[PDB]
From a paper:
The first complete archaeal Ub modifier system, including E2 and E3 enzymes, was discovered in 2011 in Candidatus Caldiarchaeum subterraneum. C. subterraneum Ub (CsUb), E1, E2, and E3 are organized in a single operon, adjacent to a second E3 protein and a JAMM protease (CsRpn11) with high sequence similarity to eukaryotic Rpn119. We have shown that CsRpn11 is highly active on its own, cleaving both CsUb precursors and, at a later stage of the ubiquitination cascade, CsUb-conjugated substrate proteins. Our bioinformatic, structural, and biochemical results reveal unique features of the archaeal proteins, but also remarkable conceptual similarities with their eukaryotic counterparts.
To obtain structural insight into the CsRpn11–CsUb interaction, we performed co-crystallization trials of CsRpn11Δ149–202 and CsUb and obtained crystals diffracting to 1.85 Å resolution. The structure was solved by molecular replacement using the CsRpn11Δ149–202 and CsUb coordinates and indeed revealed the architecture of the CsRpn11–CsUb complex. The complex is stabilized by a network of hydrogen bonds and a hydrophobic interaction involving the CsUb hydrophobic patch. Interestingly, the CsUb C-terminal tail is now found in a more elongated conformation, extending into the CsRpn11Δ149–202 binding groove which is bounded by H3 on one, and the Ins-1 region and H2 on the other side. Compared to unliganded CsRpn11, we see that Ins-1 has undergone a major transition in the complex with CsUb. Via an induced-fit-binding mechanism it is now ordered into a β-hairpin that associates with a newly formed β-strand of the CsUb C terminus. The result is a three-stranded β-sheet, which positions CsUb correctly in the binding groove and its ultimate residue Gly78 precisely at the cleavage site. In the CsRpn11–CsUb co-structure, CsRpn11 specifically interacts with C-terminal CsUb residues up to Gly78, after which the protease cleaves. Our results show that the Ub-binding mode of AMSH, Rpn11, and CSN5, which is similar to that of the SAMP–JAMM interaction, was already established in an archaeal ancestor, and that CsUb binding alone can trigger the conformational switch in Ins-1, obviating the need for additional factors.
Author numbering:
A (entry chain C): -11 to 78
B (entry chain A): -3 to 122, 126 to 148
The structure:
Amino acid sequence: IPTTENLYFQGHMKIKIVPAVGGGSPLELEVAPNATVGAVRTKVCAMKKLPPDTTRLTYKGRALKDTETLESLGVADGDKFVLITRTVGG
Amino acid sequence: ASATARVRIYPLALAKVVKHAASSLQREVAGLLVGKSAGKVLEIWDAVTGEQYGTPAYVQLDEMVMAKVAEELSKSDKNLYIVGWYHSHPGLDVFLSPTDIDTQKRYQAMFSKAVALVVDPVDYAKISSLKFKVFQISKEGRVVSLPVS
Ligand SMILES: [Zn+2]
Protein backbone atom coordinates (compact mmCIF):
# COMPACT_ATOMS: atom_id res chain seq x y z
CA ILE A 1 0.00 0.00 0.00
CA PRO A 2 1.67 3.25 -1.18
CA THR A 3 2.04 5.88 1.55
CA THR A 4 -0.11 8.32 -0.52
CA GLU A 5 -2.89 5.78 -1.14
CA ASN A 6 -4.49 6.79 2.16
CA LEU A 7 -4.72 10.36 0.79
CA TYR A 8 -6.51 9.07 -2.33
CA PHE A 9 -9.45 7.76 -0.30
CA GLN A 10 -9.85 10.67 2.15
CA GLY A 11 -13.51 11.66 1.95
CA HIS A 12 -16.12 9.42 0.37
CA MET A 13 -18.50 12.23 -0.62
CA LYS A 14 -18.85 12.58 -4.38
CA ILE A 15 -20.06 15.83 -5.85
CA LYS A 16 -20.95 16.73 -9.39
CA ILE A 17 -19.88 20.10 -10.86
CA VAL A 18 -21.59 21.29 -14.03
CA PRO A 19 -19.78 23.94 -16.06
CA ALA A 20 -22.43 26.59 -16.87
CA VAL A 21 -21.04 27.50 -20.29
CA GLY A 22 -20.20 25.05 -23.06
CA GLY A 23 -21.11 21.39 -23.22
CA GLY A 24 -18.06 20.06 -21.48
CA SER A 25 -18.04 17.06 -19.20
CA PRO A 26 -19.30 17.54 -15.65
CA LEU A 27 -16.68 16.78 -13.02
CA GLU A 28 -17.30 14.21 -10.35
CA LEU A 29 -15.02 15.09 -7.45
CA GLU A 30 -14.33 13.09 -4.33
CA VAL A 31 -14.22 15.47 -1.32
CA ALA A 32 -14.59 15.57 2.51
CA PRO A 33 -17.34 17.41 4.48
CA ASN A 34 -14.59 19.63 6.00
CA ALA A 35 -13.49 20.84 2.51
CA THR A 36 -14.13 24.45 1.62
CA VAL A 37 -16.03 25.58 -1.40
CA GLY A 38 -12.81 27.35 -2.40
CA ALA A 39 -10.87 24.05 -2.34
CA VAL A 40 -13.54 22.50 -4.63
CA ARG A 41 -13.51 25.45 -7.00
CA THR A 42 -9.71 25.36 -7.12
CA LYS A 43 -9.75 21.72 -8.26
CA VAL A 44 -12.47 22.49 -10.81
CA CYS A 45 -10.52 25.41 -12.25
CA ALA A 46 -7.35 23.25 -12.42
CA MET A 47 -9.23 20.51 -14.32
CA LYS A 48 -10.81 23.02 -16.73
CA LYS A 49 -7.69 25.17 -17.18
CA LEU A 50 -9.40 28.20 -15.80
CA PRO A 51 -7.90 31.13 -13.92
CA PRO A 52 -8.83 31.19 -10.24
CA ASP A 53 -10.64 34.52 -9.97
CA THR A 54 -13.43 34.41 -12.55
CA THR A 55 -16.02 31.87 -11.41
CA ARG A 56 -18.25 30.91 -8.51
CA LEU A 57 -19.92 27.71 -7.42
CA THR A 58 -23.70 27.57 -6.93
CA TYR A 59 -25.67 25.10 -4.91
CA LYS A 60 -29.44 24.91 -4.70
CA GLY A 61 -30.41 28.44 -5.57
CA ARG A 62 -27.41 30.42 -4.36
CA ALA A 63 -23.93 31.44 -5.16
CA LEU A 64 -21.44 30.12 -2.61
CA LYS A 65 -18.57 31.90 -0.94
CA ASP A 66 -15.20 30.10 -1.20
CA THR A 67 -14.78 30.28 2.58
CA GLU A 68 -17.92 28.18 3.35
CA THR A 69 -17.42 24.51 4.23
CA LEU A 70 -19.37 21.78 2.40
CA GLU A 71 -20.32 20.58 5.89
CA SER A 72 -21.93 23.98 6.67
CA LEU A 73 -24.10 23.69 3.53
CA GLY A 74 -25.49 20.20 4.29
CA VAL A 75 -23.87 18.77 1.14
CA ALA A 76 -24.31 15.00 0.70
CA ASP A 77 -22.84 12.33 -1.58
CA GLY A 78 -24.26 12.89 -5.07
CA ASP A 79 -25.10 16.61 -4.81
CA LYS A 80 -24.61 18.88 -7.79
CA PHE A 81 -23.06 22.34 -8.14
CA VAL A 82 -22.89 24.68 -11.12
CA LEU A 83 -19.81 26.65 -11.99
CA ILE A 84 -20.94 30.09 -13.19
CA THR A 85 -19.32 33.25 -14.44
CA ARG A 86 -20.69 36.83 -14.46
CA THR A 87 -22.80 38.15 -17.29
CA VAL A 88 -22.31 41.92 -17.27
CA GLY A 89 -22.45 44.35 -20.14
CA GLY A 90 -21.92 48.01 -20.85
CA ALA B 1 -8.05 33.69 -36.49
CA SER B 2 -10.75 32.72 -34.00
CA ALA B 3 -12.19 29.62 -32.29
CA THR B 4 -15.57 29.94 -34.08
CA ALA B 5 -15.63 30.27 -37.86
CA ARG B 6 -19.26 31.40 -38.20
CA VAL B 7 -22.53 31.55 -36.37
CA ARG B 8 -25.96 30.22 -37.34
CA ILE B 9 -28.85 31.72 -35.43
CA TYR B 10 -32.29 30.18 -35.47
CA PRO B 11 -34.62 32.95 -36.61
CA LEU B 12 -36.90 32.69 -33.56
CA ALA B 13 -33.89 32.94 -31.24
CA LEU B 14 -32.83 36.16 -32.98
CA ALA B 15 -36.45 37.40 -32.86
CA LYS B 16 -36.53 36.77 -29.07
CA VAL B 17 -33.36 38.85 -28.61
CA VAL B 18 -34.67 41.69 -30.76
CA LYS B 19 -38.03 41.75 -29.01
CA HIS B 20 -36.42 41.70 -25.60
CA ALA B 21 -34.21 44.65 -26.57
CA ALA B 22 -37.01 46.56 -28.24
CA SER B 23 -39.25 46.17 -25.18
CA SER B 24 -36.80 48.16 -23.01
CA LEU B 25 -35.39 51.08 -24.97
CA GLN B 26 -34.64 52.89 -21.69
CA ARG B 27 -31.96 50.40 -20.49
CA GLU B 28 -29.58 47.73 -21.58
CA VAL B 29 -30.97 44.22 -21.32
CA ALA B 30 -29.09 40.93 -21.27
CA GLY B 31 -29.62 37.26 -21.53
CA LEU B 32 -28.11 33.96 -22.51
CA LEU B 33 -27.58 32.18 -25.84
CA VAL B 34 -28.40 28.48 -25.91
CA GLY B 35 -27.15 26.10 -28.58
CA LYS B 36 -24.21 23.92 -29.51
CA SER B 37 -21.11 23.91 -31.67
CA ALA B 38 -20.98 21.83 -34.82
CA GLY B 39 -17.33 21.70 -35.68
CA LYS B 40 -16.30 25.35 -36.02
CA VAL B 41 -19.89 26.53 -36.58
CA LEU B 42 -21.67 27.86 -33.52
CA GLU B 43 -25.40 27.19 -33.56
CA ILE B 44 -27.69 29.42 -31.59
CA TRP B 45 -30.92 27.52 -31.00
CA ASP B 46 -32.56 29.75 -28.37
CA ALA B 47 -32.11 32.87 -26.25
CA VAL B 48 -33.35 33.01 -22.68
CA THR B 49 -33.28 35.58 -19.90
CA GLY B 50 -34.25 36.31 -16.37
CA GLU B 51 -33.88 38.63 -13.41
CA GLN B 52 -31.52 41.50 -14.04
CA TYR B 53 -30.64 45.09 -13.28
CA GLY B 54 -29.82 47.57 -15.99
CA THR B 55 -29.40 51.22 -16.93
CA PRO B 56 -28.75 52.93 -20.26
CA ALA B 57 -25.03 52.18 -19.86
CA TYR B 58 -24.86 48.88 -17.93
CA VAL B 59 -26.57 45.57 -17.29
CA GLN B 60 -26.01 42.58 -15.04
CA LEU B 61 -27.96 39.35 -15.37
CA ASP B 62 -28.61 37.70 -12.00
CA GLU B 63 -26.06 34.88 -11.80
CA MET B 64 -28.74 32.40 -10.73
CA VAL B 65 -30.23 32.66 -14.27
CA MET B 66 -27.15 31.00 -15.73
CA ALA B 67 -27.11 28.47 -12.88
CA LYS B 68 -30.74 27.47 -13.43
CA VAL B 69 -30.44 27.33 -17.25
CA ALA B 70 -27.22 25.27 -17.17
CA GLU B 71 -28.59 22.73 -14.68
CA GLU B 72 -31.82 22.33 -16.74
CA LEU B 73 -29.94 21.84 -20.01
CA SER B 74 -27.51 19.40 -18.36
CA LYS B 75 -30.37 17.36 -16.89
CA SER B 76 -32.29 17.24 -20.19
CA ASP B 77 -31.75 14.80 -23.07
CA LYS B 78 -31.06 17.68 -25.48
CA ASN B 79 -27.39 18.17 -26.30
CA LEU B 80 -27.71 21.94 -26.00
CA TYR B 81 -25.90 24.27 -23.60
CA ILE B 82 -25.16 27.88 -22.96
CA VAL B 83 -22.97 29.08 -25.84
CA GLY B 84 -22.85 32.75 -25.14
CA TRP B 85 -24.70 35.83 -24.03
CA TYR B 86 -26.40 38.88 -25.44
CA HIS B 87 -27.01 42.42 -24.49
CA SER B 88 -28.51 45.52 -25.93
CA HIS B 89 -26.96 48.89 -26.47
CA PRO B 90 -29.84 51.25 -27.20
CA GLY B 91 -28.69 54.26 -29.20
CA LEU B 92 -25.05 53.42 -28.48
CA ASP B 93 -24.22 51.36 -31.63
CA VAL B 94 -22.75 47.88 -31.80
CA PHE B 95 -19.36 47.06 -30.25
CA LEU B 96 -17.91 45.25 -27.24
CA SER B 97 -17.12 47.69 -24.45
CA PRO B 98 -14.27 47.02 -22.00
CA THR B 99 -16.83 45.53 -19.58
CA ASP B 100 -18.22 43.32 -22.30
CA ILE B 101 -14.75 42.17 -23.31
CA ASP B 102 -14.00 41.09 -19.75
CA THR B 103 -17.28 39.14 -19.57
CA GLN B 104 -16.55 37.57 -22.96
CA LYS B 105 -12.98 36.58 -22.04
CA ARG B 106 -14.45 34.74 -19.06
CA TYR B 107 -17.06 32.97 -21.24
CA GLN B 108 -14.34 31.90 -23.68
CA ALA B 109 -12.13 30.57 -20.92
CA MET B 110 -14.94 28.14 -20.00
CA PHE B 111 -16.04 27.45 -23.61
CA SER B 112 -13.55 28.38 -26.34
CA LYS B 113 -16.27 28.83 -29.00
CA ALA B 114 -18.44 31.22 -26.93
CA VAL B 115 -19.83 34.37 -28.52
CA ALA B 116 -21.32 37.74 -27.41
CA LEU B 117 -24.29 39.10 -29.39
CA VAL B 118 -24.79 42.88 -29.19
CA VAL B 119 -28.00 44.45 -30.56
CA ASP B 120 -28.92 48.13 -30.87
CA PRO B 121 -32.73 48.20 -31.14
CA VAL B 122 -33.03 51.79 -32.22
CA ASP B 123 -31.10 51.30 -35.49
CA TYR B 124 -31.45 49.18 -38.65
CA ALA B 125 -28.60 47.96 -40.91
CA LYS B 126 -28.58 49.81 -44.26
CA ILE B 127 -32.39 46.11 -48.05
CA SER B 128 -32.84 46.41 -44.27
CA SER B 129 -31.88 44.19 -41.37
CA LEU B 130 -31.58 44.14 -37.61
CA LYS B 131 -28.68 46.10 -36.09
CA PHE B 132 -26.54 43.46 -34.44
CA LYS B 133 -23.20 41.67 -34.42
CA VAL B 134 -21.86 38.52 -32.96
CA PHE B 135 -18.43 38.94 -31.46
CA GLN B 136 -15.65 36.74 -30.26
CA ILE B 137 -12.21 37.41 -28.88
CA SER B 138 -9.73 36.06 -31.40
CA LYS B 139 -6.79 33.81 -30.60
CA GLU B 140 -4.49 36.86 -30.43
CA GLY B 141 -6.93 38.80 -28.19
CA ARG B 142 -8.74 41.15 -30.62
CA VAL B 143 -12.50 41.53 -30.83
CA VAL B 144 -13.70 40.12 -34.14
CA SER B 145 -17.18 40.32 -35.62
CA LEU B 146 -18.10 36.81 -36.84
CA PRO B 147 -20.00 35.90 -40.03
CA VAL B 148 -23.63 35.28 -39.09
CA SER B 149 -26.46 33.52 -40.96
ZN1 LIG C 1 -21.88 46.38 -24.25
